[PDB]
Write an enzyme that holds these catalytic residues in place. Sequence first.
Site, PDB file in Angstrom:
ATOM      1  N   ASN A  45       0.940  -1.279  -0.329  1.00 34.76           N
ATOM      2  CA  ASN A  45      -0.148   0.023  -0.120  1.00 34.76           C
ATOM      3  C   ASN A  45       1.062   1.294   0.008  1.00 34.76           C
ATOM      4  OD1 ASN A  45      -2.249   0.933   2.775  1.00 34.76           O
ATOM      5  ND2 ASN A  45      -2.438   1.536  -0.093  1.00 34.76           N
ATOM      6  N   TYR A  85      -8.568  12.763   0.492  1.00 34.08           N
ATOM      7  CA  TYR A  85      -8.068  12.043   1.602  1.00 34.08           C
ATOM      8  C   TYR A  85      -7.579  13.406   2.190  1.00 34.08           C
ATOM      9  CZ  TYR A  85      -5.067   9.003   4.032  1.00 34.08           C
ATOM     10  OH  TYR A  85      -4.305   8.003   5.331  1.00 34.08           O
ATOM     11  N   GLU A  94     -10.386   8.173   9.176  1.00 31.79           N
ATOM     12  CA  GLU A  94      -9.832   8.601   8.230  1.00 31.79           C
ATOM     13  C   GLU A  94     -10.876   9.141   6.629  1.00 31.79           C
ATOM     14  OE1 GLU A  94      -8.383   5.314   5.592  1.00 31.79           O
ATOM     15  OE2 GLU A  94      -5.996   6.017   6.016  1.00 31.79           O
ATOM     16  N   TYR A  96     -12.362   9.596   2.496  1.00 32.24           N
ATOM     17  CA  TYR A  96     -11.902   9.715   0.824  1.00 32.24           C
ATOM     18  C   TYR A  96     -12.738  10.277  -0.255  1.00 32.24           C
ATOM     19  CZ  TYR A  96      -8.398   6.070   1.471  1.00 32.24           C
ATOM     20  OH  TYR A  96      -7.538   5.241   2.042  1.00 32.24           O
ATOM     21  N   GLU A 184      -3.555   6.511  -3.971  1.00 28.89           N
ATOM     22  CA  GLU A 184      -3.163   5.923  -3.173  1.00 28.89           C
ATOM     23  C   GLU A 184      -3.488   4.430  -4.612  1.00 28.89           C
ATOM     24  OE1 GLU A 184      -5.395   4.909   0.444  1.00 28.89           O
ATOM     25  OE2 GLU A 184      -4.330   3.060  -0.067  1.00 28.89           O
TER      26      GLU A 184
HETATM   27  C1  LIG Z   1      -5.816   4.523   5.042  1.00 25.75           C
HETATM   28  O1  LIG Z   1      -4.592   4.993   4.149  1.00 25.75           O
HETATM   29  C2  LIG Z   1      -3.421   4.230   4.593  1.00 25.75           C
HETATM   30  C3  LIG Z   1      -3.064   4.920   5.990  1.00 25.75           C
HETATM   31  O2  LIG Z   1      -3.192   6.077   6.739  1.00 25.75           O
HETATM   32  C4  LIG Z   1      -1.749   6.200   7.203  1.00 25.75           C
HETATM   33  O3  LIG Z   1      -1.059   5.598   8.151  1.00 25.75           O
HETATM   34  C5  LIG Z   1       0.141   5.580   8.784  1.00 25.75           C
HETATM   35  C6  LIG Z   1       0.419   7.372   8.895  1.00 25.75           C
HETATM   36  O4  LIG Z   1       1.615   8.091   8.847  1.00 25.75           O
HETATM   37  C7  LIG Z   1       0.019   8.172   6.808  1.00 25.75           C
HETATM   38  O5  LIG Z   1       0.211   9.010   6.843  1.00 25.75           O
HETATM   39  C8  LIG Z   1      -1.272   7.471   6.662  1.00 25.75           C
HETATM   40  O6  LIG Z   1      -1.747   8.021   5.507  1.00 25.75           O
HETATM   41  C9  LIG Z   1      -4.402   4.100   7.108  1.00 25.75           C
HETATM   42  O7  LIG Z   1      -3.585   2.629   7.981  1.00 25.75           O
HETATM   43  C10 LIG Z   1      -5.402   3.938   5.377  1.00 25.75           C
HETATM   44  F1  LIG Z   1      -7.059   2.737   6.496  1.00 25.75           F
END
Ligand SMILES: *[C@H]1OC[C@@H](O[C@@H]2OC[C@@H](O)[C@H](O)[C@H]2O)[C@H](O)[C@H]1F
Length: 206
Positions: A45, A85, A94, A96, A184
């Site tokens: 991811n 986002y 979180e 979107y 993403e």
């Molecule tokens: C949605 O996007 C990815 C993740 O979010 C990250 O978590 C770690 C943080 O440091 C980052 O800034 C975020 O983007 C989340 O698990 C997922 F649900």
Amino acid sequence: QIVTDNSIGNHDGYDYEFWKDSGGSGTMILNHGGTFSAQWNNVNNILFRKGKKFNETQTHQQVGNMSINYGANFQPNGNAYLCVYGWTVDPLVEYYIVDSWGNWRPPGATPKGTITVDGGTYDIYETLRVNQPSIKGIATFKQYWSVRRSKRTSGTISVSNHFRAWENLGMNMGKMYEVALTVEGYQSSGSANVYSNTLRINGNPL
Ligand SMILES: *[C@H]1OC[C@@H](O[C@@H]2OC[C@@H](O)[C@H](O)[C@H]2O)[C@H](O)[C@H]1F
């Protein structure tokens, strides 16, 4: 301004972030203003974004009207999103607003409603992440979604209208932490060139 690993900073007034979990690779080139390009390969991811990070003291109403004008050449090879986002805190959420995607229209849940805005129709969803990465450590938190019914890759997203729709549906929002145009990728490869990205707060650009 070349970012190929986890990084948070400010570039030409925009708060940028590169975030990935282990495996595969990505490259983000920070370009003028809110713009950037992204490429990713064989990731689990990855997220690339430029927008505004906030100090966790204001509701979206107190920040004011948020609107993003953008354009991107979005070329996923597999699963990916082109979206606005961000996060709230207290509660940790979180979110979107998805305007385009790759092979899979997210998020795989039953819709809770619909919003018409910005010439489109979006389905609204709420999903749950359990013990996953977050801005506040490994956490369990809701994800709020607006997902357009058909794809587009340029236009204006009236962010605050989405927030009002979510709150009307009882999707509680906390204090703002971030709002950002984001690409993403998940278990995929691809590229995206975000050639236009302007966040306006109360009509004024960052
Ligand atoms: C949605 O996007 C990815 C993740 O979010 C990250 O978590 C770690 C943080 O440091 C980052 O800034 C975020 O983007 C989340 O698990 C997922 F649900």
